[PDB]
Amino acid sequence: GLIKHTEYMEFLKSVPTFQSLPEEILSKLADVLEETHYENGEYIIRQGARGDTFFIISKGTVNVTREDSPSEDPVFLRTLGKGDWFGEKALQGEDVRTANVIAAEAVTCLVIDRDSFKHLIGGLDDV
Ligand SMILES: Nc1nc(=O)c2ncn([C@@H]3O[C@@H]4CO[P@@](O)(=S)O[C@H]4[C@H]3O)c2[nH]1
Numbered sequence: 001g002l003i004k005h006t007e008y009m010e011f012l013k014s015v016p017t018f019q020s021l022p023e024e025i026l027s028k029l030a031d032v033l034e035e036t037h038y039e040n041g042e043y044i045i046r047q048g049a050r051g052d053t054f055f056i057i058s059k060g061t062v063n064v065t066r067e068d069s070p071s072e073d074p075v076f077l078r079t080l081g082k083g084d085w086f087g088e089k090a091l092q093g094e095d096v097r098t099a100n101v102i103a104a105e106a107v108t109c110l111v112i113d114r115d116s117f118k119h120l121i122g123g124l125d126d127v
């Protein structure tokens with residue numbers, strides 16, 4: 001959350017894929033977000049895993065890295081920080097993780113799973 005509801009709304013509204021959603025849907029998404037914490041060096045997403053979660057960074061920074069084959073060391077792609085996001089295609093069921101996302105310091109993310117998201121957006125075309 002209640003205290004953070006408005007903060008969560010601001011984070012959600014800043015994601016371009018979400019910024020046209022009805023206000024009520026964004027409010028309900030804010031209600032179902034979970035906060036998760038990670039330590040420096042922890043993989044938030046591991047390339048090659050299958051997952052169903054999308055992340056918005058509320059604290060800290062992460063390294064996005066990617067390996068071109070399983071036996072090759074990954075290469076650094078970019079840093080993401082507060083207000084940035086990653087993993088969105090998992091909400092559309094594209095569950096194959098295509099890059100690693102690794103905490104570069106203490107990180108907090110707001111996390112939405114596909115089931116919670118589909119429940120809230122799946123009725124828009126009906127209404
Ligand atoms: N492949 C890739 N190349 C990049 O340059 C890149 N920058 C950010 N990300 C994100 O890392 C996530 C990892 O999980 P997913 O594959 S479900 O989605 C991904 C993206 O959201 C990137 N991914």
Ligand SMILES: [Ca+2]
Binds near residue numbers: 010014
């Ligand atoms: Ca914000």
